[PDB]
């Protein structure tokens, strides 16, 4: 790969770079520095490359095409950069040339071929329909792909990738005025989408995730009105009857229930309040560690429950001793017993945790402190098991996340959003320090690499840009430093955070950043030298 070759003023140079370097090298342009994106995705390049792609796509004879894979990838990479990079903006004559190229591939007699090589290029064409804002333009093709799909197509990884792209088109179409104006009249699309979701062959198969996506996009169609409305409703009713919320086909049932509940009236489908029933079915095990921790879980062994309770119990004691709490919570906090809700896998978490807890699940779990003053508030840590989580409980992120409950109830006044000063360094630093104690090789390593942060910088850390090195490793280092060298100061700070005096908290740690920077560096030096 040579990313600089894509920066030439000559469109032929750029075309040649696409063709010779191929898709794996074009990948770099999605992430490249702005200078490269601005030069690779000039309007003239997008237009000239699309025009070349049109001719090549017309000539395509099936069996895959490395060049067309790379060319369509490049075109939709341009729309990616145009979205995120304020210095990349297309003139109005770009997208019609791109639409012409997609048309050429769509109208090719080979468009519906079933093969992995064809799927590699077909995938990038289908995603370009979304990236280029052409969600309104290929609904008959979306419909054909939904109805043609079968067990033979489903054998091929890249055909699964490609046809799964039609759900990306449907989702992105919400922002496309022509799409929103026509989608509600697409009765054949609605029937094919519903019948795709109802394919019993998908259950337990490599394409189940596609059927679940189809059920979700079908439920989303209830937000539109038109001649397809009765078909959408009929097919959703069939999904809710054929499958169930916990059991065979529940990924499709729950996918559809998610969007139906949000965009339509749950009572038209008989699924109102399904989330609470679902909770009792999925989180069917209850194991009370103690008055301060209770586990609800899907499928843990007794040994795992015992291990989780004793690990948390050890951290709980270490926390209260280290933070000198006297086991007295902050005021206006009645989060007396943490509920630890553990699904059997990340897959299960992504399927069930969303509706049960009203959360996004594109993550590794989360602790929900809620509003600690409100009667009936429930503190919920939501998590899953994983093969490479910590023995012997094998609950992903358990030891770190558990400290957030303790820090929230005994150190930080109010709910999660109460602070009016930045506190990420403390929250994540204390979660790391209590859970890992002095065993943190990654923290030593980030000193050794010579790139560091001052205390001033650490205290300003935010989640924006998610610098995990800064947030977790340098947060840990500042916290550990303060506990080892200035514990009296930490106690002074906690007087303010425990009452919600965030301005006083800021003034307190502002003094630390002025006074202690050279000692912080000396302490880092000693830590590194100990390692050597």
């Amino acid at each position: 790969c040579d990313v600089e070759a894509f920066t030439s003023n000559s469109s032929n140079d750029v075309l040649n770079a696409i063709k010779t370097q191929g898709a794996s090298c074009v990948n770099a342009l999605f992430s490249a520095e702005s200078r490269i994106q601005e030069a690779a995705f000039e309007s003239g390049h997008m237009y000239n490359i699309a025009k070349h792609t049109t001719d090549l796509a017309k000539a395509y004879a099936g069996g895959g095409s490395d060049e067309l894979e790379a060319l369509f990838l490049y075109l939709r990479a341009g729309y990616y950069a145009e979205f995120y990079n304020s210095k990349v903006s297309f003139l109005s004559w770009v997208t019609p040339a791109v639409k012409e190229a997609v048309d050429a591939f769509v109208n090719n007699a080979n468009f519906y071929e079933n093969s992995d090589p064809h799927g590699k290029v077909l995938s990038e064409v289908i995603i370009t329909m979304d990236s280029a804002g052409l969600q309104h333009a290929y609904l008959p093709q979306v419909t054909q792909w939904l109805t043609r799909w079968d067990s033979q197509y489903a054998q091929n990884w890249y055909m699964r990738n490609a046809v799964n792209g039609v759900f990306t088109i449907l989702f992105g179409g919400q922002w496309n005025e022509q799409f929103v104006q026509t989608i509600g009249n697409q009765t054949e699309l609605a029937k094919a989408l519903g019948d795709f979701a109802l394919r019993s062959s998908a259950i337990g198969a490599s394409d189940e995730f596609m059927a679940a996506n189809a059920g979700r996009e079908l439920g989303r169609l209830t937000k539109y009105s038109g001649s397809a409305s009765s078909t959408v409703k009929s097919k959703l009713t069939e999904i809710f009857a054929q499958y169930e919320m916990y059991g065979r086909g529940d990924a499709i049932w729950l996918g559809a229930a998610d969007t139906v509940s949000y965009y339509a009236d749950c009572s038209d489908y008989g699924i109102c309040n399904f989330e609470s029933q679902l909770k009792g079915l999925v989180l069917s095990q209850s194991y009370t560690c103690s008055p301060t921790i209770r586990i609800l879980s899907q499928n843990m062994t007794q040994d795992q429950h015992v291990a989780a309770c004793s690990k948390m119990g050890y951290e709980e004691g270490y926390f209260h001793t280290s933070l000198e709490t006297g086991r007295q919570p902050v005021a206006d906090d009645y989060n007396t017993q943490l509920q630890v809700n553990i699904f059997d896998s990340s897959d299960d978490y992504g399927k069930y945790a969303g509706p049960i807890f009203n959360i996004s699940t594109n993550n590794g779990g989360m602790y929900l402190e809620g509003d600690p003053a409100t009667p009936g508030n429930i503190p919920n840590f939501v998590a899953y098991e994983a093969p490479y989580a910590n023995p012997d409980h094998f609950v992903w992120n358990l030891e770190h996340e558990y400290v957030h409950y303790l820090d929230g109830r005994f150190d930080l006044y109010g709910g999660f959003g109460h602070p009016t000063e930045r506190i990420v360094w403390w929250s994540e630093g204390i979660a790391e320090y209590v859970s890992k104690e002095n065993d943190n090789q990654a923290a030593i390593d980030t000193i050794k690499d010579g790139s560091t942060f001052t205390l001033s910088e650490i205290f300003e850390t935010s989640y924006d840009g998610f610098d995990v090195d800064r947030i977790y490793r340098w947060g840990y280092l500042a916290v550990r430093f303060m506990f080892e060298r200035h514990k009296d100061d930490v106690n002074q700070m906690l007087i303010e955070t425990r009452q919600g005096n965030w301005a006083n908290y800021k003034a307190t740690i502002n003094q630390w950043a002025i006074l202690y920077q050279s000692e912080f560096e000396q302490w880092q030096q000693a830590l590194v030298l100990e390692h050597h």
């Binding site: 939709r76 729309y79 990616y80 995603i127 979304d130 990236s131 990306t168 919400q174 922002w175």
Partner: peptide, 12 residues
């Protein structure tokens, strides 16, 4: 939120 697609997953 709308976000354009980045990379598709390759077969391991």
């Amino acid at each position: 939120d709308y976000a354009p697609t980045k990379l598709l997953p390759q077969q391991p």
